[PDB]
Design a protein around this ligand. Structure first.
Ligand SMILES: O=c1[nH]c(-c2ccc(-c3ccccn3)cc2)nc2ccccc12
Ligand SMILES: [Zn+2]
Lengths: 47, 161
């Protein structure tokens, strides 16, 4: 795993083209996330 | 040490998690190639993941980050899709769960859009799709995502295509 940029704890990927996309995030220490919910699902075929 | 507790669909907690899943679907620039073609999900089950040791590992690091950032963890709830969901819920996130080739370097990636994380359920690029039918847009096979508590602390902003 890489290191966070010096002086930072994560990276935020802000979309700069697709105006509808939301942010994505990266952490470099597994201790910085806890898997609170497990969601079981299917994708639905559009009508 | 991990226990999974089912949430009832009548529970407000089930309902708020389902709403975050459903309301953060978007269209993807690959036209559905990686994650499939869909506008919404059929939620089958939502379980609380309970592990005391893993929770304390999280809160220990959260306090370290907060103390480095004027008592602000900058904690978010974010989606994670991965072929290794089973490993994650039993053993915790670590370096073997990192996307080595990701746009922002080798780390563990999370999304605000549930449909972004859905693209990784069967691996990078959707891999070969579901194991039963080899279909990245399978409407039959059950998928799993994690909705995760994530400490961002001071986050480096990358503007990005
Ligand atoms: O939920 C995500 N998972 C993943 C992802 C990517 C790769 C892997 C992985 C982990 C170990 C070995 C091979 N692939 C696990 C999860 N990448 C994302 C990128 C952007 C936004 C969200 C995600
Ligand atoms: Zn299938």
């Amino acid at each position: 795993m890489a290191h966070s940029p010096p002086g930072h704890h994560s990276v935020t990927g802000r979309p700069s083209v697709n105006g509808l996309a939301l942010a994505e995030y990266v952490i470099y220490r597994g201790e910085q996330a806890y898997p609170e919910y497990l969601i079981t699902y299917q994708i639905m075929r559009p009508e | 040490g991990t226990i999974l507790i089912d949430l009832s669909p009548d529970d407000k907690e089930f309902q708020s998690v389902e709403e975050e899943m459903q309301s953060t679907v978007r269209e993807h620039r690959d036209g559905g190639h990686a994650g499939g073609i869909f506008n919404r999900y059929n939620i089958l089950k939502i379980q609380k993941v309970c592990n005391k040791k893993l929770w304390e590992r999280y809160t220990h690091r959260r306090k370290e980050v907060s103390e480095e950032n004027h008592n602000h963890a900058n904690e978010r709830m974010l989606f994670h899709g991965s072929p290794f969901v089973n490993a994650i819920i039993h053993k915790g996130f670590d370096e073997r769960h990192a996307y080595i080739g990701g746009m922002f370097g080798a780390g563990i990636y999370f999304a605000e859009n549930s449909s972004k994380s859905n693209q990784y359920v069967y691996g990078i690029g959707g891999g070969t799709g579901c194991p039963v039918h080899k279909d990245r847009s399978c409407y039959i096979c059950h998928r799993q995502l994690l909705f995760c508590r994530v400490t961002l602390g001071k986050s480096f902003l990358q503007f990005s295509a």
